[PDB]
C-alpha cells in the first residue's frame, strides 16, 4: 500500500542516540587559567599614558594576550568595581596586549588611579 514516489533511493532517517558515558574521560574539569587576575598584569606609569588619564578619563593596562574585550571589561569591574563605557585594545610590537579602558563620565579617572598606586 506504500509506494515509492521518487525514483531515487535515499538513506532512511535512522534513530541515533546521544552520549551516556559510563565514566567521564577526564577526571575533573580544568580550572580557568584565564581568570580576572591573570588577565590584568600591571598598568602603565608612562607620561604618554599619564596624559591620557585626566584628559580622556581612561586607564591603561597591560593585558594577557589570550584575552577578549568582553573579559577585559568584566575584569576591571570585578577588581576595582568601576563601570566601563567602552574598552579599547591593541597589541604592542613586543608580544603583549595593551588596553585603553574608557570609563563612564560619572567616575573620575585620577581619583581611582590613586587607589591603583599609579600617579
Partner 1 sequence: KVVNPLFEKRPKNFGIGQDIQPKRDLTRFVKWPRYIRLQRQRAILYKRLKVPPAINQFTQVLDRQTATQLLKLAHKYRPETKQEKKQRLLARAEKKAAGKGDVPTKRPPVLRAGVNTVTTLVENKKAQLVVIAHDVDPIELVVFLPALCRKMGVPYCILKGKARLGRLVHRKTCTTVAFTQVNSEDKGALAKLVEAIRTNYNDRYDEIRRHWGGNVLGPKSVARIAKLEKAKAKELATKLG
* 97-103/84-91 β-pairing: antiparallel
Give the range of 4-12, 19-27, 29-37, 70-78 binding RNA by CB under 7 A.
4-12
Closer residue to partner 1, CB minimum distance, 8 or 27: 8
Compute the least distance from the CB of residue 36 to partner 1, in Å: 58
Quickly tell me which residue has 580576572 as its cell: 36
Compute the least distance from the CB of residue 15 to RNA, in Å: 4
Query: Which residues from 5-44 bind partner 1, rule CB under 8 A?
Result: 5-9
How many Cα atoms occupy the beta-carbon half-sphere of 3 within 13 Å? 3
Closer residue to partner 1, CB minimum distance, 12 or 117: 12
Compute the least distance from the CB of residue 2 to partner 1, in Å: 10
The Cα-based distances of 82 to 23, 26, 42 in angstroms read 44, 38, 17
The helix/strand/coil state of 38 is coil
Amino acid at each position: 500500500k506504500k509506494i515509492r514516489t521518487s525514483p531515487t533511493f535515499r538513506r532512511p532517517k535512522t534513530l541515533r542516540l546521544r552520549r551516556q558515558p559510563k565514566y567521564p574521560r577526564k577526571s575533573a574539569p580544568r580550572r580557568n587559567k584565564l581568570d580576572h587576575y591573570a588577565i590584568i598584569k600591571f598598568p602603565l606609569t608612562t607620561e604618554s599614558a599619564m596624559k591620557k588619564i585626566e584628559d580622556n578619563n581612561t586607564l591603561v593596562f597591560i593585558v594577557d594576550v589570550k584575552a577578549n574585550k568582553h573579559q577585559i571589561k568584566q575584569a576591571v569591574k570585578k577588581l576595582y568595581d568601576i563601570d566601563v563605557a567602552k574598552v579599547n585594545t591593541l597589541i604592542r610590537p613586543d608580544g603583549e596586549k595593551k588596553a585603553y579602558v574608557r570609563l563612564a563620565p560619572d567616575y573620575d579617572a585620577l581619583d581611582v588611579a590613586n587607589k591603583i598606586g599609579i600617579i
